[PDB]
Design a protein around this motif. Structure first.
Motif, short mmCIF file in Angstrom:
data_model
loop_
_atom_site.label_atom_id
_atom_site.label_comp_id
_atom_site.label_asym_id
_atom_site.label_seq_id
_atom_site.Cartn_x
_atom_site.Cartn_y
_atom_site.Cartn_z
N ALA A 190 0.83 -1.20 0.00
CA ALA A 190 0.00 0.00 0.00
C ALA A 190 0.86 1.25 0.00
O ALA A 190 0.59 2.21 -0.74
N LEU A 191 1.93 1.26 0.80
CA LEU A 191 2.79 2.43 0.87
C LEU A 191 3.59 2.62 -0.42
O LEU A 191 3.74 3.74 -0.91
N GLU A 192 4.12 1.52 -0.96
CA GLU A 192 4.92 1.61 -2.18
C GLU A 192 4.09 2.11 -3.35
O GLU A 192 4.53 2.99 -4.11
N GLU A 193 2.88 1.58 -3.51
CA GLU A 193 2.04 2.00 -4.63
C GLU A 193 1.63 3.46 -4.49
O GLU A 193 1.61 4.20 -5.48
N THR A 194 1.30 3.90 -3.27
CA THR A 194 0.87 5.28 -3.09
C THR A 194 2.01 6.26 -3.38
O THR A 194 1.82 7.25 -4.10
N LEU A 195 3.20 5.98 -2.84
CA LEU A 195 4.33 6.89 -3.03
C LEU A 195 4.78 6.92 -4.48
O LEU A 195 5.32 7.93 -4.94
N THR A 196 4.57 5.82 -5.22
CA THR A 196 4.93 5.78 -6.63
C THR A 196 3.99 6.65 -7.46
O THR A 196 4.44 7.38 -8.35
N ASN A 197 2.69 6.59 -7.18
CA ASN A 197 1.70 7.28 -8.00
C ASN A 197 1.42 8.71 -7.56
O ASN A 197 0.78 9.45 -8.31
N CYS A 198 1.88 9.12 -6.39
CA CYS A 198 1.59 10.47 -5.93
C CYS A 198 2.51 11.49 -6.60
O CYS A 198 3.58 11.16 -7.12
N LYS A 199 2.05 12.74 -6.60
CA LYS A 199 2.83 13.89 -7.03
C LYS A 199 3.37 14.64 -5.82
O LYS A 199 2.89 14.48 -4.70
N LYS A 200 4.38 15.48 -6.07
CA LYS A 200 5.03 16.20 -4.98
C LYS A 200 4.11 17.23 -4.33
O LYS A 200 4.42 17.70 -3.22
N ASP A 201 3.01 17.59 -4.98
CA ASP A 201 2.03 18.51 -4.43
C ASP A 201 0.90 17.80 -3.68
O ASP A 201 0.00 18.47 -3.17
N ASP A 202 0.93 16.48 -3.63
CA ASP A 202 -0.15 15.75 -2.98
C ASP A 202 0.07 15.68 -1.48
O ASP A 202 1.15 15.97 -0.95
N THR A 203 -0.98 15.26 -0.77
CA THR A 203 -0.91 14.96 0.65
C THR A 203 -1.22 13.49 0.85
O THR A 203 -2.19 12.97 0.27
N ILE A 204 -0.40 12.81 1.64
CA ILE A 204 -0.62 11.41 2.01
C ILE A 204 -0.93 11.37 3.50
O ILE A 204 -0.06 11.69 4.33
N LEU A 205 -2.15 10.98 3.84
CA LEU A 205 -2.55 10.81 5.24
C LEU A 205 -2.58 9.32 5.56
O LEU A 205 -3.28 8.56 4.90
#
Ligand SMILES: O=c1ccn([C@@H]2O[C@H](COP(=O)(O)OP(=O)(O)O)[C@@H](O)[C@H]2O)c(=O)[nH]1
Ligand SMILES: [Mg+2]
Length: 482
Positions: free
Chosen positions: A445-460
């Motif tokens: 879950a963490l690997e997929e989210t960090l791969t697909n996110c942009k630098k302007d996103d927020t990960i909670l």
């Protein structure tokens, strides 16, 4: 009756804790109430079960008396032969409560005392109040730190830790967190909050909120209210510091005794938050950038801690110095990274989840990713209520993505997600038309989210034990220290 002095009769001690003495009566010298593993000669040990080995160790350590609920095996006859006094009780909580009373009386009687309870926020509020006082050079005791939360009468940890510090310092303040809804295995210990608060005889009781959680111990928010209100009924003097914004803590004002002043904090109150800042008596007190990247809960807990200290007559300037230097507890809306904004919060019940999502969305520029670990082995209902809160909070929010995980790869057997728990969680999301991805493993879950996110996103990141390992996993996959 609570005696003063370093001697007691065993039959008197048995009477004080509602027990029966097993063995010959005798005048004993007393040290402190302790655990068996730390006991010093003449200490009294409260332990809800013992066996023959414990009796032998108590003899070797010269323990004055062992207080227990369940003497396993041949413990009783062995203790009689060894002359280890055993006091048999049916409810260990009464022994632990007496130990607190006796320790306060004999070791820290000249103290101002705060009891802090509530479903969410009581550890942070306790921690904040304690920090304000010690940062001001006051001598204080608290039962909660970054590594522990000794907030029950199940064992003698409060009495023991209080005694240990009171022997070294001239304490002026006791800042005690009290569990409002406390379980003994799977059974609710009714009136725990009343009993523990009464044992402290506080000057101030703080109630942060009343919220659904601990399903199984309770079923309804009314039950949480009834149990939590025990702390306010226990208060005989001083101040009830109550959250005005929570309807059930608001209800508790009617329950105060005649010589107790109610002190409300929240909307339209003397201590309040508005226009990005905290105000006290309409004066701007803590400013926006003095509260960077903070949660709604962080603000409400600060209001609670300010209110408690004002009721203790701490000067506002000293209160402020404490707030500005406060170090928060682990996974309390913790900022792990800024690019992308990664927030790690232990939200674990409907109110905490709603709070965490709304606070994260407040700080979010583009897309909000919510990564949520199901609450394994806590039952279907709490996971259904939590998925419901996640869904209702997000349905109005634009540009989000939900990633659900079981964290099968990191949780221990007491926190494994059950098939019925995963089912009710995911089925609730679908019921509310929330699109989601699901991963059995937290790491994926963490690997997929960090791969697909942009630098302007927020990960909670939200979750209890299922999300505790996320920060170390984030370093392993080289996302942190960003
Ligand atoms: O000091 C205590 C308090 C509670 N309990 C257990 O927790 C249950 C809840 O106790 P409560 O005080 O709510 O009421 P009771 O069940 O005794 O009527 C008890 O029945 C016991 O099984 C215990 O072992 N020791
Ligand atoms: Mg908190």
């Amino acid at each position: 009756a609570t005696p003063a002095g370093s001697h007691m009769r065993l039959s008197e001690l048995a009477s004080y804790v509602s027990g029966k003495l097993i063995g010959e009566d005798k005048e004993i010298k007393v040290g402190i109430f302790n655990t068996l593993g730390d006991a010093n000669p003449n200490d009294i040990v409260i332990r809800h079960w013992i066996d023959e080995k414990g009796v032998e160790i108590a003899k070797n350590k010269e323990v004055s008396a062992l207080i227990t609920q369940n003497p396993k095996g041949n413990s009783l006859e062995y203790a009689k032969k060894l002359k280890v006094p055993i006091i048999l009780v049916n409810k260990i909580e009464l022994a632990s409560a007496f130990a607190i009373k006796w320790t306060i009386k004999n070791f820290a009687p000249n103290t101002y005392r705060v009891v802090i309870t509530g479903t969410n926020g009581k550890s942070t509020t306790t921690h904040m109040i304690y920090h304000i006082l010690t940062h001001a050079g006051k001598k204080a005791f608290t039962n909660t730190d970054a590594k522990s939360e000794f907030n029950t009468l199940i064992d003698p940890m409060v009495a023991k830790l209080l005694a240990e510090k009171a022997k070294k310092e001239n304490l002026e303040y006791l800042v005690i967190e009290v569990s409002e809804v406390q379980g003994w295995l799977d059974r609710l210990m009714k009136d725990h909050a009343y009993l523990m608060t009464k044992s402290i005889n506080p000057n101030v009781v703080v109630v942060t909120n009343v919220a659904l959680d601990h399903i199984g111990l309770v079923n309804s928010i009314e039950e949480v209210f009834e149990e939590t209100s025990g702390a306010v009924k226990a208060l005989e003097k001083g101040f009830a510091v109550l959250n005005y914004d929570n309807e059930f803590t608001r209800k508790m004002a009617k329950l105060t005794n005649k010589n107790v002043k109610v002190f409300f904090y929240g909307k339209n109150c003397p201590v309040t938050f508005k226009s990005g800042g905290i105000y006290v008596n309409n004066d701007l007190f803590i400013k926006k950038e003095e509260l960077p990247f903070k949660s709604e809960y962080f603000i409400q807990n600060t209001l609670a801690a300010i209110s408690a200290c004002l009721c203790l007559n701490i000067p506002p300037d000293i209160i402020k110095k404490g707030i500005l230097t406060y170090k928060p507890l682990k996974r309390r809306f913790s900022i792990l990274c800024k690019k992308p904004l990664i927030i790690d919060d232990f939200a674990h019940n409907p109110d905490g989840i709603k709070m965490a999502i709304k606070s994260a969305k407040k700080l979010t520029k583009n897309k909000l990713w919510v990564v949520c670990a199901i609450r394994g082995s806590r039952g279907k209902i709490i996971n259904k209520l939590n998925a419901e809160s996640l869904s209702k909070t997000l349905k109005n929010i634009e540009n989000y993505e939900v990633v659900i995980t079981n964290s099968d790869d990191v949780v221990d057997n007491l926190n494994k997600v059950k098939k019925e728990e995963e089912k009710t969680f995911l089925k609730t999301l679908e019921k509310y038309n929330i699109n989601y991805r699901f991963h059995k493993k937290l790491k994926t879950a963490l690997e997929e989210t960090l791969t697909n996110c942009k630098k302007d996103d927020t990960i909670l990141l939200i979750g209890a034990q299922g999300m505790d390992p996320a920060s170390k996993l984030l370093k392993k996959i080289k996302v942190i220290p960003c």
